[PDB]
Design an enzyme around this catalytic site. Structure first.
Site, PDB file in Angstrom:
ATOM      1  N   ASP A  24       0.822  -1.226   0.000  1.00  0.00           N
ATOM      2  CA  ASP A  24       0.000   0.000   0.000  1.00  0.00           C
ATOM      3  C   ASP A  24       0.851   1.270   0.000  1.00  0.00           C
ATOM      4  O   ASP A  24       0.671   2.128   0.875  1.00  0.00           O
ATOM      5  CB  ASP A  24      -0.917   0.048   1.219  1.00  0.00           C
ATOM      6  CG  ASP A  24      -1.773  -1.192   1.374  1.00  0.00           C
ATOM      7  OD1 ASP A  24      -2.286  -1.687   0.335  1.00  0.00           O
ATOM      8  OD2 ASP A  24      -1.907  -1.665   2.539  1.00  0.00           O
ATOM      9  N   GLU A 225     -11.517   0.677  -3.793  1.00  0.00           N
ATOM     10  CA  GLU A 225     -10.729   1.234  -2.667  1.00  0.00           C
ATOM     11  C   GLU A 225      -9.582   2.013  -3.307  1.00  0.00           C
ATOM     12  O   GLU A 225      -9.678   2.390  -4.483  1.00  0.00           O
ATOM     13  CB  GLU A 225     -10.214   0.094  -1.767  1.00  0.00           C
ATOM     14  CG  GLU A 225      -9.527  -1.030  -2.568  1.00  0.00           C
ATOM     15  CD  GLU A 225      -9.236  -2.315  -1.756  1.00  0.00           C
ATOM     16  OE1 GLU A 225      -9.759  -2.471  -0.637  1.00  0.00           O
ATOM     17  OE2 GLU A 225      -8.490  -3.177  -2.269  1.00  0.00           O
TER      18      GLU A 225
HETATM   19 NA    NA Z   1      -2.851   4.833  -0.548  1.00  0.00          NA
END
Ligand code: NA
Ligand SMILES: [Ca+2]
Ligand code: NA
Length: 487
Positions: A24, A225
Site C-alpha cells: 500500500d 478502494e
Molecule cells: Na494509498
C-alpha cells in the site's frame, strides 16, 4: 559474492526493495528526495515454521524508505503507528489504534515551518493522523482518537472507511479522500457494483488534523478502494481501484486503476479511463492494485504494489506485497497512457556522491541481508544498520561518482563479535577490487568502531559492491554507514 538477488536484479529498479516487504505505498516528494511510506507486510508462519498466506496480522507499523535517484533506497525502518492491544511492545504512538493500514502523507508549511502529517486506516475503524517535524519523525498523536469515523458528517454510506489519500492544494488547503467497499453485503446488485457511492472527499482544517464541513460523495463508477489524488495542468485527478464484481464495461475493467477529472478538488468528477492493469497482468504472484501518482524531480510517476518478492521466494505471492515505480504519461488532451509496469523500472536519475556519509542501509541491490534499527551512537533519525550478513553476502549502490581524482580511502562503521572483511568492488560482485576493509572484533554486536582502509583504482562513475566475507557461519558484523575520502 555467492548470494543472489531475490527479485530486484542488478541493473533493475523494481521492486524498489526486496530485503523486506512493503504494501500500500504512497509517495511524499520533499527537498530533493522521494519518500515511500508503506503498510508493514511481514511473512507470517504456521506453527511448524512453514509460510502461510498474509492475514494482515502484522499491519501495525508504517515502513519508510527514500531516494534522491530512484535506484538507491535509504531504509528508514518502521514507524510504530498502532499502539492498542500491546503496540509495538508498548511503543505504539496511536494508543487507540490496533492497525495502521495504507498510509497517506502530506507536508504543509505552518507558521513558516514545514510540518508532516502521516494518515492511516485503523482497519475499518476510522482514519488517524500523526504529525512530525521531519518526513521520518519522530511522530506525535495530537488527537488521541480517529480523525474521521462513520459519524463524521457526510461519511455515512461508506462501506469500508479506509485507504486515505491526503492532498495539499496550491492554495494550502488540505483534502482527504477515503472510502470504498460495495453496499449490499453478500450479494450486491448489478447497480450497487456499478455505483457503490462509497468514495468520499472531505476538506481538512488549516491544521491538517481536523475536517471542515461534511464529506462529499465521489460517484466513482465500480469504486473499490485505493483513493488517489494528483493535480496536473490545473485539473484534479481522482484515481481509484475498480472493483471485481458484477459485469463491467470494456472501459472499466475489473481491478484496474480508474481515474476521473474535475476543475475542483471536491468535484464534480467525470470518469476518464484507466491507466494501470492488475499486478498479475504483468507479474508473477497476482494481487490487488494499490497506487499513488506523484511528480518527483519534474517527472510524473506512479508508485504501486505487486507480489514480486514473495513470488520469487515461495513460488506464489501469498498476499505479500512489494513496492514498484514506473513512469506515468499525461497526453495533450489530459488523458493518461497505460502504465507500462515492469521490472526494469526507472533509470537512475542522478549519481550518488560517495564522499559524504552514506548509510550502509542506503543501497540499490543486495544479495540477502536485512536492515534493522541500530544501536550505533549518532546517525540520522531512526538510524538503521545492515545485519544478517553471512560469508558471500553483498550490498551495492548504483552509479557512485568517484570523480576524475578518485578515492583515497574507505571508512565503515561496524560492530562485530568475531570480525570479517568488506571487499569494495566496482561494477559487479566479482568486479575490480579497490580495497578490502578488515573488520575487527569490536567487543560485540552493539559496540561500534569506525575503521579506515586504503583505496586505489576508484575513479569515475560505477556501481559499487560491498562484499562481505569471514569464516563464521552466522552474523559476521553489523554495518551502519560508510564514507570514501577524496584523493
Ligand atoms: Na494509498
Ligand atoms: Ca545507518
Ligand atoms: Na544474509
Amino acid at each position: 559474492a555467492t548470494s543472489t538477488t531475490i527479485a530486484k536484479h542488478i541493473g533493475n529498479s523494481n521492486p524498489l526493495i526486496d530485503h523486506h516487504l512493503g504494501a500500500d505505498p504512497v509517495a511524499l516528494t520533499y527537498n530533493g528526495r522521494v519518500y515511500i511510506y508503506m503498510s508493514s507486510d511481514d511473512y507470517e508462519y504456521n506453527s511448524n515454521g512453514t509460510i502461510k498466506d498474509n492475514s494482515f496480522a502484522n499491519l501495525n507499523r508504517v515502513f519508510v524508505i527514500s531516494s534522491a535517484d530512484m535506484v538507491n533506497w535509504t531504509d528508514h525502518g518502521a514507524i510504530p503507528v498502532a499502539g492498542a492491544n500491546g503496540a509495538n511492545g508498548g511503543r505504539g504512538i496511536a494508543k487507540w489504534a490496533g492497525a495502521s493500514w495504507a498510509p497517506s502523507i502530506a507536508v504543509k508549511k505552518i507558521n513558516g515551518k514545514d510540518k508532516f502529517f502521516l494518515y492511516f486506516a485503523n482497519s475499518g475503524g476510522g482514519i488517524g493522523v500523526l504529525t512530525a517535524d521531519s518526513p521520518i519523525g519522530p511522530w506525535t498523536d495530537p488527537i488521541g482518537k480517529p480523525l474521521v469515523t462513520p459519524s463524521t458528517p457526510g461519511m455515512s454510506g461508506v462501506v469500508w472507511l479506509f485507504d486515505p489519500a491526503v492532498f495539499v492544494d496550491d492554495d494550502g488547503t488540505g483534502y482527504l479522500y477515503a472510502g470504498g467497499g460495495v453496499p449490499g453485503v453478500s450479494n450486491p446488485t448489478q447497480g450497487q457494483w456499478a455505483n457503490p457511492k462509497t468514495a468520499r472527499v472531505i476538506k481538512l482544517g488549516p491544521d491538517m488534523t481536523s475536517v471542515v464541513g461534511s464529506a462529499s460523495t465521489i460517484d466513482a463508477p465500480f469504486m473499490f478502494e485505493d483513493s488517489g489524488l494528483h493535480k496536473y495542468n490545473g485539473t484534479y485527478y481522482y484515481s481509484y481501484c475498480i472493483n471485481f464484481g458484477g459485469t463491467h464495461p470494456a472501459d472499466k475493467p475489473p481491478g484496474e486503476i480508474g481515474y476521473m477529472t474535475s476543475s475542483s478538488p471536491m468535484g464534480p468528477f467525470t470518469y476518464r479511463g484507466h491507466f494501470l492493469k492488475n499486478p498479475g497482468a504483468f507479474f508473477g504472484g497476482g494481487g490487488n492494485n494499490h497506487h499513488a501518482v506523484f511528480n518527483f524531480k519534474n517527472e510524473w510517476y506512479v508508485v504501486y504494489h505487486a507480489q514480486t518478492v514473495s513470488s520469487a521466494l515461495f513460488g506464489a505471492g501469498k498476499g505479500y506485497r512489494s513496492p514498484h515505480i514506473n513512469k506515468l504519461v499525461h497526453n495533450a488532451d489530459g488523458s493518461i497512457q497505460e502504465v507500462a509496469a515492469n521490472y526494469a523500472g526507472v533509470t537512475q536519475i542522478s549519481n550518488l556522491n560517495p564522499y559524504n556519509r552514506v548509510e550502509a542501509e542506503t543501497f540499490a541491490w543486495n544479495g540477502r541481508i536485512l536492515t534493522e534499527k541500530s544501536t550505533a551512537p549518532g546517525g540520522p533519525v531512526n538510524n538503521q544498520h545492515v545485519t544478517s550478513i553471512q560469508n558471500g553476502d553483498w550490498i551495492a549502490v548504483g552509479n557512485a561518482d568517484f570523480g576524475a581524482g578518485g578515492a583515497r580511502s574507505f571508512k565503515a562503521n561496524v560492530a562485530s563479535t568475531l570480525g570479517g572483511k568488506i571487499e569494495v568492488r566496482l561494477d559487479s560482485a566479482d568486479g575490480k577490487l579497490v580495497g578490502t576493509l578488515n573488520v575487527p572484533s569490536t567487543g560485540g554486536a552493539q559496540t561500534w568502531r569506525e575503521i579506515e582502509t586504503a583505496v586505489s583504482g576508484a575513479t569515475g562513475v560505477h556501481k559499487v559492491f560491498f562484499v562481505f566475507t569471514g569464516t563464521g557461519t552466522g552474523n559476521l558484523f553489523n554495518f551502519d554507514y560508510w564514507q570514501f575520502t577524496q584523493r
